[PDB]
Design a protein around this nucleic acid. Structure first.
Ligand code: 0G6
Ligand code: NAG
Ligand code: K
Ligand code: NA
Lengths: 258, 34
DNA sequence: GGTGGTGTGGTTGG
């Protein structure tokens, strides 16, 4: 996350860390949506152009965390994966259309002050809140800057980072980029003239874009960090998988078995 | 199967559940007016 | 250390 700040304790108890077994490295974020289901972005698991194709056994997930690297004894819970479901029409050839995947845990996890699932949106919530100018919250342990070019600053944060960002109107999103945008995506970020900043970055993928419903006080995941160009550049905007538009699939998979 | 958790989803034990606001949730809510 | 270190608290033991 670029120009966010430290997360408070238990501020997003649905944050999940997607962690590679060997070598040990943080791959991505993700969200806890029930006791046995985790949502993330498809390109975290499967992106052929970068020769990336993870199987369940390659991976762990870590839940309840705050610190990026330290094992947080008696707080965090580490779970193995039973099954990985990638959207069958995830478009990795071109623009990451439908950048979403579900991961089913081998064993349901217990909730705690630091571990608690987030809500999936319904038609009314999506319709009330998914509007230009409305702000959501993004979280992750991804990069604090553009790491692929010399830049001053630390690369990664010691602890979970948060930033709040306004949804942007679709035509601005379109003109911000040469990459083909689809209705399975939306974009968020401050305009240059707004003089406030912030963005998700490499490493934050899979992490949730959430909004708090003023009608019931609950946090809902409207998006998944999907892609961007640079991090936090004037005139570009972070792109996010549109959760609600992909809800039908989410539900079809999640409710398929008892 | 979804499993456990839904009835109580999106309510954070250390915040909503104790009637505590995090430091910036209010910025979100104020973005939802106009 | 096992997982750092403004180390035996902390978001948790010893
Ligand atoms: C996998 C995620 O960590 C990461 C998210 C970066 C989000 N960026 C900003 N500014 N909010 N995603 C990526 O790095 C994806 C995966 C493949 C390349 N990529 C990109 O975002 C490119 N920078 C642009 C792009 C390339 C191909 C297809 C779509 C987008
Ligand atoms: C990913 O790898 C699996 C083997 O585990 C293979 O059967 C599958 O076709 C792969 N898909 C792609 C697009 O590489
Ligand atoms: K210690
Ligand atoms: Na920007």
């Amino acid at each position: 996350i670029v120009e966010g700040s430290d997360a408070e304790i238990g501020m997003s108890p649905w944050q999940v860390m997607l962690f590679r077994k060997s070598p040990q490295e943080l791959l991505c974020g993700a969200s806890l949506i029930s006791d046995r289901w985790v949502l993330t972005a498809a390109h975290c698991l499967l992106y052929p152009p970068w020769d990336k194709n993870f199987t369940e056994n390659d991976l762990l997930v870590r839940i309840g965390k705050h610190s990026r690297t330290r094992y947080e004894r008696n707080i965090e819970k580490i779970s193995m994966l039973e099954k990985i479901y990638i959207h069958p029409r995830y478009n990795w050839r071109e623009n990451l259309d439908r950048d979403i995947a579900l991961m089913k845990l081998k064993k349901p996890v217990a909730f705690s002050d630091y571990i608690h699932p987030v809500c999936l949106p319904d038609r009314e919530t999506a319709a009330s809140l998914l509007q230009a100018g409305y702000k959501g919250r993004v979280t992750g342990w991804g990069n604090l800057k553009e790491t692929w070019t010399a830049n001053v600053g630390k690369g990664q944060p010691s602890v979970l980072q948060v930033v709040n960002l306004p949804i942007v109107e679709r035509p601005v999103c379109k003109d911000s980029t040469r990459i083909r945008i689809t209705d399975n995506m939306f974009c968020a970020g401050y305009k240059p003239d707004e003089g406030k900043r912030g963005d998700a970055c490499e490493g934050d993928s899979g992490g949730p874009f959430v909004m708090k419903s003023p009608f019931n006080n609950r946090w809902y995941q409207m998006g998944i960090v999907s892609w961007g160009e640079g991090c936090d550049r004037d005139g570009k905007y972070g792109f996010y998988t549109h959760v609600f538009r992909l809800k039908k699939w989410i539900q079809k998979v999640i409710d398929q078995f008892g | 199967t979804f499993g456990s958790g839904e009835a109580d989803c999106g309510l954070r034990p250390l915040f909503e559940k104790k009637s505590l606001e995090d430091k910036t949730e209010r910025e979100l809510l104020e973005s939802y007016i106009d």
